[PDB]
Design a protein around this ligand. Structure first.
Ligand SMILES: CCCCCCCCCCCCCCCCCC(=O)OC[C@H](COP(=O)(O)OCCN)OC(=O)CCCCCCCCCCCCCCCCC
Ligand SMILES: CCCCCCCCCCCCCCCCCC(=O)OC[C@H](COP(=O)(O)OCCN)OC(=O)CCCCCCCCCCCCCCCCC
Ligand SMILES: CCCCCCCCCCCCCCCCCCCC(=O)O[C@H](COC(=O)CCCCCCCCCCCCCC)COP(=O)(O)OCCN
Ligand SMILES: CCCCCCCCCCCCCCCCCCCC(=O)O[C@H](COC(=O)CCCCCCCCCCCCCC)COP(=O)(O)OCCN
Ligand SMILES: CCCCCCCCCCCCCCCCCCCC(=O)O[C@H](COC(=O)CCCCCCCCCCCCCC)COP(=O)(O)OCCN
Ligand SMILES: CCCCCCCCCCCCCCCCCCCC(=O)O[C@H](COC(=O)CCCCCCCCCCCCCC)COP(=O)(O)OCCN
Ligand SMILES: CCCCCCCCCCCCCCCCCCCC(=O)O[C@H](COC(=O)CCCCCCCCCCCCCC)COP(=O)(O)OCCN
Ligand SMILES: CCCCCCCCCCCCCCCCCCCC(=O)O[C@H](COC(=O)CCCCCCCCCCCCCC)COP(=O)(O)OCCN
Ligand SMILES: CCCCCCCCCCCCCCCCCCCC(=O)O[C@H](COC(=O)CCCCCCCCCCCCCC)COP(=O)(O)OCCN
Ligand SMILES: CCCCCCCCCCCCCCCCCCCC(=O)O[C@H](COC(=O)CCCCCCCCCCCCCC)COP(=O)(O)OCCN
Ligand SMILES: CC(C)CCC[C@@H](C)[C@H]1CC[C@H]2[C@@H]3CC=C4C[C@@H](O)CC[C@]4(C)[C@H]3CC[C@]12C
Ligand SMILES: CC(C)CCC[C@@H](C)[C@H]1CC[C@H]2[C@@H]3CC=C4C[C@@H](O)CC[C@]4(C)[C@H]3CC[C@]12C
Ligand SMILES: CC(C)CCC[C@@H](C)[C@H]1CC[C@H]2[C@@H]3CC=C4C[C@@H](O)CC[C@]4(C)[C@H]3CC[C@]12C
Ligand SMILES: CC(C)CCC[C@@H](C)[C@H]1CC[C@H]2[C@@H]3CC=C4C[C@@H](O)CC[C@]4(C)[C@H]3CC[C@]12C
Lengths: 341, 341, 341, 341
């Protein structure tokens, strides 16, 4: 049923399943925008494949050939199957548009599936090539940051009663993780553009290319006289193919700008999470994280993503908000917070 | 079976599944009215799609064409499939109402599915764009509020034997979360109005537009003489489509007032949860939360929603009720409550 | 449906299931490259088998024979089944290409399944022959290494306030595990090359070998006169077979270089994990692990794989990174880390 | 689908399910070679049964009889069913090869299933007759051995700062468990040889025995004149049967050497696990476990299997390896290990 496909591919957490493993529990490792881009670009062609052959649209066979009335039931079935298999043998069939349109009409689901798999590949490469590195690294970074906050709080309390910095500093120099990331991003963009090109071509077919003339006159039937010289076959479910093709095209051409936007990692580094902790006196009072096509920018983005997980950041951020309001004091309100654990 | 669809889409918690994650356990993040509006507006077209093709209403094919008696079984099947695919090719078929009614009759399930997906989109954008922010924020707010209550109770006990305020204060100024919310609300309203327009048009079709004249005379069949000039086809299951369309129309036009009501967030801020804690002496004796198209109003609504979760509010609220009755005393009954944990 | 096969064989963790047992929890025992090579080489022919007979491509029967019109329905069915079973009996059928092409056309799915099983065998032999040995050994090695790190940290702290080496040393001499590994690697390579050869041959068939002349004239039918001398049969779904064959061929010929690369275990030993711990003063300041076709190289690779699991390595590695930056000091920053447990 | 059968019977842990019970958690009770032999010998005929009737090979019915054209559809169906049921009644049908080939062709799946069950029986008898005894016994043995190791370690530590032997000794005399084991081994061998004999006979059939002449002339039809004297039936799916039969034959004749090898339990007792603990001074310095067709040999094999489970053995074995290298000292390195628990 259509509604089951709808649930499975839109309303269920399809490709939204968190890593079912104790290694990555609560950590993102994939920016939400990239995750939704991948989910769309992959699940949409699958959904359209499943829709093109839903029992509510498909009338039956994918082809019909209109054998003469003198033919039996089984001779008609033979003609149908023969021409279905003969869309490939270019010697027999003769269509106005050519053999390539028929090739495409027969294998449209396979092509959409190929595009889905190709679009799924770069995210898989990212999840299995650069995900564990950044996972471990930002895990250590959050641990060290929370520890720095606890140290600042203990120092302020004692007054009342920087290795992670060097790590981010050295990360600013290497650029392995960022070229991997922009490589996957560029790969997805290229595959999406090729898919839009193919879909725009396919949707642009003569809309009568699904009608082709087929002839069962190979082998011993060539001398047979009771068979007509040619049969008028028609590839059913081609209009549905072109419609879903134009839909996929319109969606992918809307998606491509999002991808080419995600391509610019330095421009996206905004709402500096480093400033909140910079308000604290103990840690270095410096953002020290911006303006560079290097892994530092990538870690900035992933920190801005996974930063709500540490309570230390939540308290420091609400305190920063009140500082923008300017009501109380930093160490007094920090001691009043009492959120070490 | 119909009853299985009934269970799945009405009696099961379809789209009522709580977030299966330790991050959001017991927190709402979606007002109950918005949740039910989304569940209705999305699951209803899905349910009607599943009903239109239930095995108990559908007689069989979606089309039948009444080929002459001299035709074989397979020639008749070919005519049926050809005309089914030829509802799109406007050159062949000639109907009184036009080709657009037939287009709509064939793709009615796809259109209902498109409307379901479009109506599901804004809630998804809300759940993935503004949900974590408000989640963390109101979580911190409830923690600070419960802590304020424990502090007031300890102070009253010692007599016997305000950062969250500034947070709500600064929230009153920014308006990001409220424009996001009213944007999703307005989006759902626009999509619902477009759906009602389309359904009112579709249901208003001539009810004979499902009968169209089709002609298999393209290709080599144009010279064929044993074929009749045209066939009388009829799109079965169109009356069912129009009936379910009028049902969906009547439901969506009842739903739209609820949406346009939810559009007014300040008017909905009622039964001030802040007053209960204002009865307490320690916390600021002021509502300080009303009368503004800002995130403060949004947080008021979400607090009024998720406020039954904190026991501190339950005790203070029953105490406020007794105060409205006027029997005992506030600190004495608070010490007699003994509900710190 | 095609999309279900897609999910099951690409998007689900097919052959990516971790060992569901408390013996191996978090340990790899299979290099990621070998794991993906096996998953591809095995699941791809299965996916193509499932695709070749998807309800969206398959028109129906796998064969049709075009009996004369005077034949009944059941006589036609008999002719079809007879010729289907008679692709093997070489005395009856006479095809231009020969009987071997028809043999292959009938049993193509069985051959692809055989190749899948054969490619799955060497990984199974590795997982059940050499996996527990290396599991226990590298488990002990990581335990001893973490213990060495804790000892160095305690020594540095006391200043403030080598059996695993011999094990790796003796492992450098034996070469059982490495010949097992390169034997499985060479086995997979040979099977892949044979599969590419067979697929290149099959895809290179005349594309009309699916049409063969069959004759039901054995037994009592030899004297029957109302039967024609021969029937023109055609093996449907052969073009699909050749297409998926060319796809599998193109994928396997891309895979073979990866395998022959994995064949060189010493060349792959890079990014020495031993150097990080060599920076520590307590443990032996020497890599002592390289340049040899022996089990030592294999353990180096498996350590480089499973080394992110021990936190001790994470701390020492970030410290080594800062040392490459050159900001602080080793024992002071180690005491400041405080990551013993 | 074929790929589902592939997953279920090869890639899933079919007959590899560990005992889902707290009594046997982590204990083997079945040597890995015997386990794989049983899994192959049982699951292979099941897999071939499931393959012989996969929807991708089976054309339809298992028989077709070619009734005359004057027959109706239902008369033809009657002829088919009659001859299918009449392969047993030897009075009616007359085939060149005889009635036994047809008997075999009809009941080939049942025979393969019978062989699968018969091969599964001896492992079941072992698992339910001698498994608990050896389970409890080797459990106690490992407990006593680990305890002996802890005692030796405590003695060495005190210097720094034998009932299990008698049990194995008395086990050397009784021979119940070993005759049970070799009885199951011999049973599996005999069943495998009988299966190879039957399969070699079946595959050696004339390949035209699937064509037989059937006659519906019993009862009132004997006087009927409009029925022909005999019908030419053909058992479809017999070539597939013979092919899968030759496959099963080739696999079983490869398996039989493995079984007859497993028959020699004393020869298999190698890589003495007793020597590792013999290196320890406390326990008896003697293997005292070899050279006898008695339960002692069986316990040696099961200990060599389940010996990696005790950490005590792992430490003593790595220490023995270093002793073969000759670097340090036994008690000092044992105290440095610190692996009592
Ligand atoms: C600038 C980078 C651009 C990257 C673009 C990527 C685009 C998407 C490609 C998707 C391909 C399918 C999905 C692959 C997922 C798994 C990839 C992976 O993790 O590969 C790891 C592999 C490890 O190789 P290994 O010899 O073990 O060396 C490292 C350890 N010492 O790493 C390897 O290098 C092994 C595989 C290649 C071997 C050489 C092949 C040519 C010879
Ligand atoms: C240089 C090595 C090259 C290896 C290439 C391997 C290629 C892939 C082969 C795949 C075969 C199918 C999958 C087999 C998986 C299980 C294999 C396994 O673990 O075998 C263990 C078996 C143990 O034999 P056992 O008598 O118990 O002796 C050891 C304990 N004392 O070990 C055995 O030796 C038993 C089986 C063989 C017995 C002798 C047969 C000939 C006589
Ligand atoms: C990806 C998208 C692929 C589409 C583009 C393919 C490039 C084809 C360009 C060459 C075309 C060609 O050879 O010309 C036709 C032959 O095509 C052919 O007959 C070649 C067939 C094209 C292959 C398409 C089949 C898709 C299979 C993909 C399945 C993947 C499965 C993944 C799981 C001739 O004919 P004509 O039209 O010129 O005749 C009228 C006279 N000009
Ligand atoms: C918005 C996207 C609109 C795309 C439509 C542009 C093509 C117009 C072509 C004529 C319109 C029409 O009805 O005729 C067919 C297209 O119909 C169609 O196929 C139009 C159906 C509209 C489908 C889009 C609805 C959902 C879009 C996004 C959903 C989310 C032609 O057919 P042809 O292209 O074969 O002939 C090639 C023509 N020279
Ligand atoms: C969303 C609701 C969409 C319905 C409204 C579409 C706007 C169509 C307006 C233009 C109509 C048009 O082009 O006129 C007809 C051609 O329509 C056509 O042939 C165009 C076909 C309209 C597209 C509707 C197909 C729905 C596909 C949506 C699937 C989405 C899938 C999502 C998973 C001509 O004919 P005539 O009647 O004038 O002839 C008698 C003479 N006047
Ligand atoms: C309450 C909503 C009532 C809607 C009915 C208004 C339309 C009346 C049109 C005539 C009545 C009738 O039986 O004829 C068909 C409508 O029937 C129908 O389709 C009426 C069936 C009533 C269905 C509503 C029942 C449940 C409503 C909510 C459930 C929750 C006409 O058919 P047409 O519209 O094609 O011809 C266009 C006519 N000029
Ligand atoms: C693995 C790939 C196997 C393909 C290669 C097999 C080698 C065959 C080489 C000999 C060929 C042969 O005997 O010649 C033909 C007979 O073949 C035959 O009739 C022999 C049939 C070949 C066996 C292929 C069947 C595959 C079964 C595998 C299933 C595995 C299942 C696993 C679960 C004669 O004919 P002609 O063409 O010369 O006549 C025209 C005159 N020259
Ligand atoms: C990239 C791989 C391209 C492989 C194509 C090379 C063969 C060209 C042969 C002519 C092209 C054509 O359309 O005719 C058939 C091949 O089509 C085909 O079968 C071409 C379809 C292309 C399929 C590859 C698309 C996905 C590749 C990887 C996906 C990941 C011939 O048919 P024949 O080979 O029987 O006749 C033997 C010819 N003398
Ligand atoms: C296990 C493998 C069993 C196969 C070997 C059975 C031994 C049969 C030896 C005697 C044969 C016999 O009686 O001769 C034929 C009658 O056979 C018959 O009619 C007897 C039928 C043989 C029984 C095979 C049926 C298998 C059932 C197993 C199902 C198990 C299910 C488990 C869940 C006569 O005929 P002819 O050929 O001599 O005529 C031409 C003239 N010589
Ligand atoms: C390796 C095992 C090879 C077994 C083949 C030996 C029998 C040869 C007989 C002639 C070859 C042939 O194609 O004709 C049929 C056998 O084909 C076949 O049935 C040969 C197909 C080969 C199947 C083996 C492929 C996988 C083996 C292991 C996979 C793991 C004869 O048929 P018949 O035996 O009824 O006539 C009895 C003949 N006088
Ligand atoms: C990503 C954006 C640019 C996609 C837009 C759709 C593009 C790729 C489509 C739309 C119309 C298409 C064209 C329509 C018709 C023809 C004529 C034919 O003889 C060659 C291909 C050609 C020239 C097509 C090329 C691809 C095309 C230009
Ligand atoms: C949300 C509320 C307002 C929905 C009410 C249903 C509306 C949208 C429906 C009900 C009747 C419909 C009309 C019925 C008939 C026609 C004539 C046709 O030639 C053009 C469309 C037009 C003019 C329709 C437009 C849409 C319509 C006005
Ligand atoms: C791994 C790489 C090398 C695989 C490349 C495909 C190879 C194996 C394929 C491609 C074309 C094939 C050839 C095509 C045609 C013929 C003629 C025939 O009478 C004998 C086999 C022979 C000679 C084939 C042998 C195998 C072949 C050479
Ligand atoms: C385990 C090994 C030995 C199995 C080898 C296959 C054996 C059992 C097969 C292969 C060929 C077979 C023979 C083929 C033909 C005949 C002639 C027939 O009138 C009696 C049975 C007899 C004599 C068969 C007996 C079984 C047989 C010898």
């Amino acid at each position: 049923a259509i509604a089951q496909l709808a649930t499975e591919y839109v309303f269920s957490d399809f490709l939204l399943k968190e890593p079912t493993e104790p290694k990555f529990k609560g950590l993102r490792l994939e920016l939400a925008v990239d995750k939704m881009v991948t989910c769309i670009a992959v699940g949409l062609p699958l959904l359209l494949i499943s829709l093109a052959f839903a029992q509510e649209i498909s009338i039956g066979t994918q082809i019909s050939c209109f054998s003469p009335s003198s033919f039996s039931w089984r001779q008609a079935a033979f003609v149908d199957s023969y021409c279905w298999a003969a869309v490939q043998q270019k010697n027999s069939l003769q269509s106005e548009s050519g053999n390539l349109p028929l090739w495409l009409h027969k294998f449209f689901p396979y092509i959409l599936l190929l595009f889905a798999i190709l679009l799924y590949l770069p995210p898989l490469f990212w999840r299995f090539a650069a995900a564990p590195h950044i996972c471990s690294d930002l895990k250590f970074i959050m641990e060290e940051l929370d520890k720095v906050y606890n140290r600042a709080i203990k120092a302020a309390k004692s007054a009342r009663d920087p290795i992670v910095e060097q790590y981010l500093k050295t990360k600013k120099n290497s650029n392995n993780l960022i070229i991997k990331y922009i490589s996957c991003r560029l790969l997805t963009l290229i595959i999406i553009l090729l898919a839009c090109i193919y879909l725009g071509y396919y949707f642009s077919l003569s809309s009568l290319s699904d009608e082709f003339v087929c002839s069962i006159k190979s082998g011993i039937l060539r001398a047979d006289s009771t068979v007509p010289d040619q049969f008028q076959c028609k590839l059913i479910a081609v209009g549905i193919f072109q419609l879903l093709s134009v839909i996929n095209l319109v969606v992918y051409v809307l998606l491509a700008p999002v991808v080419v936007y995600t391509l610019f990692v330095p421009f996206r580094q905004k709402t500096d999470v480093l400033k909140v902790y910079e308000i604290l006196p103990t840690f270095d009072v410096l953002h020290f994280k911006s303006e560079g096509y290097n892994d530092l920018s990538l870690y900035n983005l992933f920190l801005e993503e996974n930063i709500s997980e540490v309570k230390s950041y939540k308290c420091l951020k609400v305190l920063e908000n009140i500082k923008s309001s300017g009501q109380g004091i930093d160490p007094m309100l920090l001691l009043t917070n009492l959120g070490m654990i």
